[PDB]
Amino acid sequence: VSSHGYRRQTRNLFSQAFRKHGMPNTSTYLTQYAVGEYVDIKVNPAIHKGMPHKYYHGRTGIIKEVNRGSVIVLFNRILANKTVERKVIVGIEHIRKSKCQDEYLKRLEINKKIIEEAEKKGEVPVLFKRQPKGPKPAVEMLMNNIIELSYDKVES
Amino acid sequence: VNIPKTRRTYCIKCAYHTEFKVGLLKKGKDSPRKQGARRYARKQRGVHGQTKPILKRKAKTTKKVILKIECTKCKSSQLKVRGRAKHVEFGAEKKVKGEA
RNA sequence: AGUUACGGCCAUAUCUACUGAAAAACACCGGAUCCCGUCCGAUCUCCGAAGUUAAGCCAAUAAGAGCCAUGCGAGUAUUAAGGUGGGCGACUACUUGAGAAAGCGUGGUGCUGUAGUUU
RNA sequence: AGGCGAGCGCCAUGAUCAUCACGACACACUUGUUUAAGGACAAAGGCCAGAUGGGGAGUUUGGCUGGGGCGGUACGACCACAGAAUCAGAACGUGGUCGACCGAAGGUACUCACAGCGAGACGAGAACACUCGUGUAGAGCAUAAGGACUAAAGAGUGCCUGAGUGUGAGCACUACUGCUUGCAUGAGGGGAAACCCGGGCCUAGCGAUCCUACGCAUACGAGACACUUGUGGCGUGGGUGUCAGAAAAGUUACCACAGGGAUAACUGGCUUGUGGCCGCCGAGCGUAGAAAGCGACGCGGCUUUUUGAUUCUUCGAUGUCGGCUCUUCCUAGCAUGGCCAUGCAGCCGUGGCGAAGUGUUGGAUUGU
RNA sequence: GCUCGGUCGUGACACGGAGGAAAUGCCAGAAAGCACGGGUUAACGGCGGGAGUAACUAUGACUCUCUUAAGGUAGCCAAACG
RNA sequence: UAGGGGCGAAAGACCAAUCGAACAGUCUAGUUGCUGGUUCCCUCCGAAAUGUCUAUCAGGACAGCGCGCACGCAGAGAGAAGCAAGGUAGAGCAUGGGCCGGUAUCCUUAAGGAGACGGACGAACUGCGAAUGUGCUUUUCUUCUAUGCAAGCGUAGUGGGCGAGUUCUGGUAAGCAGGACUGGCGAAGAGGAAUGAACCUGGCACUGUGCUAAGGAACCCAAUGUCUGGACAGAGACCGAAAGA
RNA sequence: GCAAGUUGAGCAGAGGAAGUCUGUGAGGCGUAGUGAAGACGGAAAGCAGUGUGAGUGCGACCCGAUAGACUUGUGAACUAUA
RNA sequence: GGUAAUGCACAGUGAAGAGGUGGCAGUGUGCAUCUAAGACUAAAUACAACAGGAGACCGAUAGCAAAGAAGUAGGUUGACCG
Ligand SMILES: [K+]
Ligand SMILES: [K+]
Ligand SMILES: [K+]
Ligand SMILES: [K+]
Ligand SMILES: [K+]
Ligand SMILES: [K+]
Ligand SMILES: [K+]
Ligand SMILES: [K+]
Ligand SMILES: [K+]
Ligand SMILES: [K+]
Ligand SMILES: [K+]
Ligand SMILES: [K+]
Ligand SMILES: [K+]
Ligand SMILES: [K+]
Ligand SMILES: [K+]
Ligand SMILES: [K+]
Ligand SMILES: [K+]
Ligand SMILES: [K+]
Ligand SMILES: [K+]
Ligand SMILES: [K+]
Ligand SMILES: [K+]
Ligand SMILES: [K+]
Ligand SMILES: [K+]
Ligand SMILES: [K+]
Ligand SMILES: [K+]
Ligand SMILES: [K+]
Ligand SMILES: [K+]
Ligand SMILES: [K+]
Ligand SMILES: [K+]
Ligand SMILES: [K+]
Ligand SMILES: [K+]
Ligand SMILES: [K+]
Ligand SMILES: [K+]
Ligand SMILES: [K+]
Ligand SMILES: [K+]
Ligand SMILES: [K+]
Ligand SMILES: [K+]
Ligand SMILES: [K+]
Ligand SMILES: [K+]
Ligand SMILES: [K+]
Ligand SMILES: [K+]
Ligand SMILES: [Mg+2]
Ligand SMILES: [Mg+2]
Ligand SMILES: [Mg+2]
Ligand SMILES: [Mg+2]
Ligand SMILES: [Mg+2]
Ligand SMILES: [Mg+2]
Ligand SMILES: [Mg+2]
Ligand SMILES: [Mg+2]
Ligand SMILES: [Mg+2]
Ligand SMILES: [Mg+2]
Ligand SMILES: [Mg+2]
Ligand SMILES: [Mg+2]
Ligand SMILES: [Mg+2]
Ligand SMILES: [Mg+2]
Ligand SMILES: [Mg+2]
Ligand SMILES: [Mg+2]
Ligand SMILES: [Mg+2]
Ligand SMILES: [Mg+2]
Ligand SMILES: [Mg+2]
Ligand SMILES: [Mg+2]
Ligand SMILES: [Mg+2]
Ligand SMILES: [Mg+2]
Ligand SMILES: [Mg+2]
Ligand SMILES: [Mg+2]
Ligand SMILES: [Mg+2]
Ligand SMILES: [Mg+2]
Ligand SMILES: [Mg+2]
Ligand SMILES: [Mg+2]
Ligand SMILES: [Mg+2]
Ligand SMILES: [Mg+2]
Ligand SMILES: [Mg+2]
Ligand SMILES: [Mg+2]
Ligand SMILES: [Zn+2]
């Protein structure tokens, strides 16, 4: 039978990668955080204070409050077939800034131009949506340089 | 476990750090005049047998170390709790490193 | 263009042999009276310029070891979905999709930020 | 009121109230010695208190479990493995550990490594102390297992008792418990300072209501007022290991009741280890010679006639071992009929093939 | 287990003592029992292991060693008891 | 001589067909987590056999899944497009464990040992690493959507499950014991596999005409014939191994 | 139905009467909370009925133990012993 | 219910003439309110047999066990049963 301590089953998780042992780099400490940013959790096994519980490893959430050397992040979780919000305390050594909003922020920068012109000249924005890839395109071909294919390889 | 007989620490009444005297807490004698003692005496009185349960299936070996510390200036007291230990000594000789 | 002080990413920067280097630096170097520290002015701390490019730091060289990239291995190994497919089983063919690794070939061998100094 | 030893205790005897034996009388009480004998003793009653007490009275005698019992603890905690690469995830599944220990093995600041290997240095050897060069951990880190750590978290050296005090918010399926983190304070610590510290490098070493002991200030107190006892509030200790927590020994073949095929003792079904029977290969043996007859070391099957393994059907009932009697079926063929091989001269045999028509007995010991 | 003897200790309530305004507590005191010393199995019951050693071999009268409250005598037996 | 009492040449025997504690009557309609039963029609919606704690294991409670009444309302059991985490299958044998053999060379012996290398390996070995599955953002992103969702309040049943396909652990195995994922039977009829809870086709108000599925088409039995190769065994259509001519 | 309020308490007065009508008039809950308490104070329509679903206690959906106790109740015509 | 004694008893002990009580043990002191250890008392309240009047009750397997010669016919050794 299995046990139920705070760091159960973390032999693979919570171990350093090959040729990457030691303390964190300066960039870790010089990064500034703000309320409302999206942030991503990855535990560093060498630091023993401010570690989250291993369920949260590799998950992304939103910063709710900022303190001297730690952050409070909001998560959601299913328990007993219902949704529950959870507020997780994490030290700054175990977090990295998330990339999940990157494309959306670029798109907002384009929208922000159009939405002004749409008051002056038009009435409503064109709004620049994405579209999924359509059907295969048409082609005009010169028809020299033909290559033949054959079952010449007998494959003993 | 070895404990020194003196400890400089914060005194709540004096509101600054002071010298304290350190010793093991002592369990005092039960009083017949309290409400629980009075109730039990009356209930036991007749031909009623044993009227309250007594524990028999006991299981623990140690009990928790508890220190009483007294402020030398104002005689106020604080209670400090230290966990379970089979044996305790006050003011013995230091555990000097690198013995023969 | 190098160097030097403080750095960033942490081997394209490592490890082993050899060889070069104008100027200014960087060093080795000469002492212990004091401050400071040793079994020991070796290390650490202080006060100095008689010497020297031999060393370190910097740079080149090597069908070098190791690291980094790419091609091939290879539509190979494994795998999702499907059928009144096959086989006594062990397991395996086909149809619509996803898709490696080791080895071995070829090329590389630090890049940059802020300030100071030197034709 | 006397006496002793450098007014003290010790030794003399004289007044004041109970009081334990012993005598001698008769009045309570006792006995058909009764116009009598005993006698304040006995014997007989009453109220409290100790002792003894299966002679009796009430009651109890945990759970999980390839049925129960005996055994173990899968009953409270911790690490690793597996459970078809998030997390979770059963079995009396696998390898183990816990109920503690430590004034430093706690807190801080600085210095320097280690295990080994190759050269050296009298006694001095395999193994004594001191040196030089290499050395990504091959060492250590009190105590399982995993993770972590290199101008350190390891080994030394200095100083300190933060193993402070109030009061908030959260994480682990979250009550208890453990940990993370906010603000305010200390005539707080260590460090030049930035920084760090409200136990142990991280994941284990633990416990409610009521009662009781101690610490802390603020309350209550019966018509009024004072004091000795008492009652409230917050926090810690004293303990429940069956660990979300009753106060508890057996036996019934003299036995009762409610139920159960949720579960055993027959048969049947599935399986075939064990039991029995058959094939394949050819090392050696047979007077020569693998194979007339055998056939090691290995390998593949069939049967249900042995005993296991499991619990699907029956507990408002399927009569349980052996013998007697009587019938039918199977073949893996003991005799009787036809044949083939031979290490078949003849006699007696041995190995094989088609074949189940007819036969296969009488007794002694023993329930068999 | 039953029985006999003494106290050296413990062991109730009463009866005393000290103190306090008083209650509650405290101290002394204390029979029988218990403890301690003897008796008792036609009372309940109980009654051992290991090594060597004799002119063939076997066996061990003999020796040594551990052990106890005492180590199964006289008889009887694969017996209704192997 | 009378019931927690009698009487016994002792068997728990006997005490009015009753005795290991008599009979009569009352308290009393004693108690029951256990067995049996529980009475009219149609319409609409529709489960669970799992988790935590329990002197708990034939029982409870709390939560999860139904239904009724519903304030209200931009959502979704599906994809894309950016982004994270993971150590299984395959592949390998660089730290640790561990099997067999080595040329030149080296060390001694005149044996053996070491070896520049090759072959064989681990659920508690890893240097590399899938497919499938999981989460985050964006409708400023395709596609659907009111006969739809639905906070809140009140209250039920359930808490013995079993089986198929794909996979795993214990065991020689088992119609054996125990988990995970996606649909079933339970609570599911109809047509087909001759028959069968779960397999194939495919989800049911009540009628009438046409068409197809799965499976069939000499006869039983509604619909059948054709072409080309194999095969002779009381064979096959239903059916066992290593070994063989 | 009435509403910062609400109500068939008991009981009295009327009435050819176990009905009905009218008084007097308590109490209860509400009109705002916090603490063990001393003490302090700052949001949210209620009361009484007529019925339905549902919890708890009483025989409690219906039937069913082996047992326990109590009597100033009965029995030795069978059977035991003097 | 009565909580460091609400009421009632038994044994020891046992008052004062002045005493009792004021929902928590004790001691003191003012204040308020009563008078135990002797007796009698109407009305307003409770409920069988027997008699009278009523009813959203039951209608001969119902309603009391019993709508007729019902505690009857009949039964237990007996208590009792029907
Ligand atoms: K006389
Ligand atoms: K006389
Ligand atoms: K006389
Ligand atoms: K008894
Ligand atoms: K089992
Ligand atoms: K275990
Ligand atoms: K360790
Ligand atoms: K009072
Ligand atoms: K009063
Ligand atoms: K108290
Ligand atoms: K306790
Ligand atoms: K328990
Ligand atoms: K018993
Ligand atoms: K008997
Ligand atoms: K059996
Ligand atoms: K049965
Ligand atoms: K029989
Ligand atoms: K024959
Ligand atoms: K025959
Ligand atoms: K003998
Ligand atoms: K014998
Ligand atoms: K007799
Ligand atoms: K009998
Ligand atoms: K009786
Ligand atoms: K039950
Ligand atoms: K439906
Ligand atoms: K259960
Ligand atoms: K519920
Ligand atoms: K390996
Ligand atoms: K593996
Ligand atoms: K329920
Ligand atoms: K069912
Ligand atoms: K269904
Ligand atoms: K059919
Ligand atoms: K079947
Ligand atoms: K036909
Ligand atoms: K009810
Ligand atoms: K009954
Ligand atoms: K009177
Ligand atoms: K009748
Ligand atoms: K009669
Ligand atoms: Mg897991
Ligand atoms: Mg008493
Ligand atoms: Mg120069
Ligand atoms: Mg000097
Ligand atoms: Mg020098
Ligand atoms: Mg030079
Ligand atoms: Mg059991
Ligand atoms: Mg430490
Ligand atoms: Mg801390
Ligand atoms: Mg810590
Ligand atoms: Mg428990
Ligand atoms: Mg069964
Ligand atoms: Mg077999
Ligand atoms: Mg059989
Ligand atoms: Mg029968
Ligand atoms: Mg039957
Ligand atoms: Mg029969
Ligand atoms: Mg035959
Ligand atoms: Mg015999
Ligand atoms: Mg279940
Ligand atoms: Mg049942
Ligand atoms: Mg593999
Ligand atoms: Mg179950
Ligand atoms: Mg069907
Ligand atoms: Mg009320
Ligand atoms: Mg208000
Ligand atoms: Mg009933
Ligand atoms: Mg009883
Ligand atoms: Mg009172
Ligand atoms: Mg009629
Ligand atoms: Mg009648
Ligand atoms: Mg008669
Ligand atoms: Zn003080």
Short mmCIF file of N, CA, C and O (backbone and C1' of nucleotides) and ligand atoms in Angstrom, two decimals, chain A residues 8-9 54, chain D residues 83 87-89, ligand 42:
data_model
loop_
_atom_site.label_atom_id
_atom_site.label_comp_id
_atom_site.label_asym_id
_atom_site.label_seq_id
_atom_site.Cartn_x
_atom_site.Cartn_y
_atom_site.Cartn_z
N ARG A 8 4.91 12.80 -1.62
CA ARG A 8 4.77 11.44 -2.09
C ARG A 8 4.99 11.39 -3.60
O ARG A 8 4.58 12.30 -4.32
N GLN A 9 5.64 10.31 -4.06
CA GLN A 9 5.76 9.92 -5.46
C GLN A 9 6.59 10.91 -6.29
O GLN A 9 6.58 10.81 -7.52
N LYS A 54 2.90 19.40 -5.34
CA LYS A 54 3.31 18.91 -6.65
C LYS A 54 2.17 18.83 -7.67
O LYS A 54 2.44 18.60 -8.84
P G D 83 3.47 -0.01 -14.94
"O5'" G D 83 1.91 0.20 -14.63
"C5'" G D 83 0.92 -0.80 -15.02
"C4'" G D 83 -0.26 -0.70 -14.09
"C3'" G D 83 -1.06 0.60 -14.17
"O3'" G D 83 -2.00 0.51 -15.24
"C1'" G D 83 -0.70 0.00 -11.91
P C D 87 1.81 12.24 -12.46
"O5'" C D 87 0.53 12.80 -11.68
"C5'" C D 87 0.65 13.84 -10.69
"C4'" C D 87 -0.72 14.05 -10.12
"C3'" C D 87 -1.28 12.84 -9.36
"O3'" C D 87 -0.61 12.73 -8.11
"C1'" C D 87 -2.96 13.81 -10.73
P A D 88 -0.80 11.33 -7.35
"O5'" A D 88 -2.33 11.51 -6.95
"C5'" A D 88 -2.93 10.50 -6.16
"C4'" A D 88 -4.36 10.26 -6.59
"C3'" A D 88 -4.74 8.78 -6.66
"O3'" A D 88 -5.12 8.42 -5.35
"C1'" A D 88 -5.42 9.87 -8.64
P G D 89 -4.17 7.30 -4.70
"O5'" G D 89 -4.85 5.93 -5.21
"C5'" G D 89 -6.30 5.89 -5.44
"C4'" G D 89 -6.65 4.83 -6.46
"C3'" G D 89 -5.81 3.55 -6.40
"O3'" G D 89 -6.51 2.68 -5.52
"C1'" G D 89 -5.94 4.32 -8.65
MG MG I 42 0.77 8.83 -8.67
#
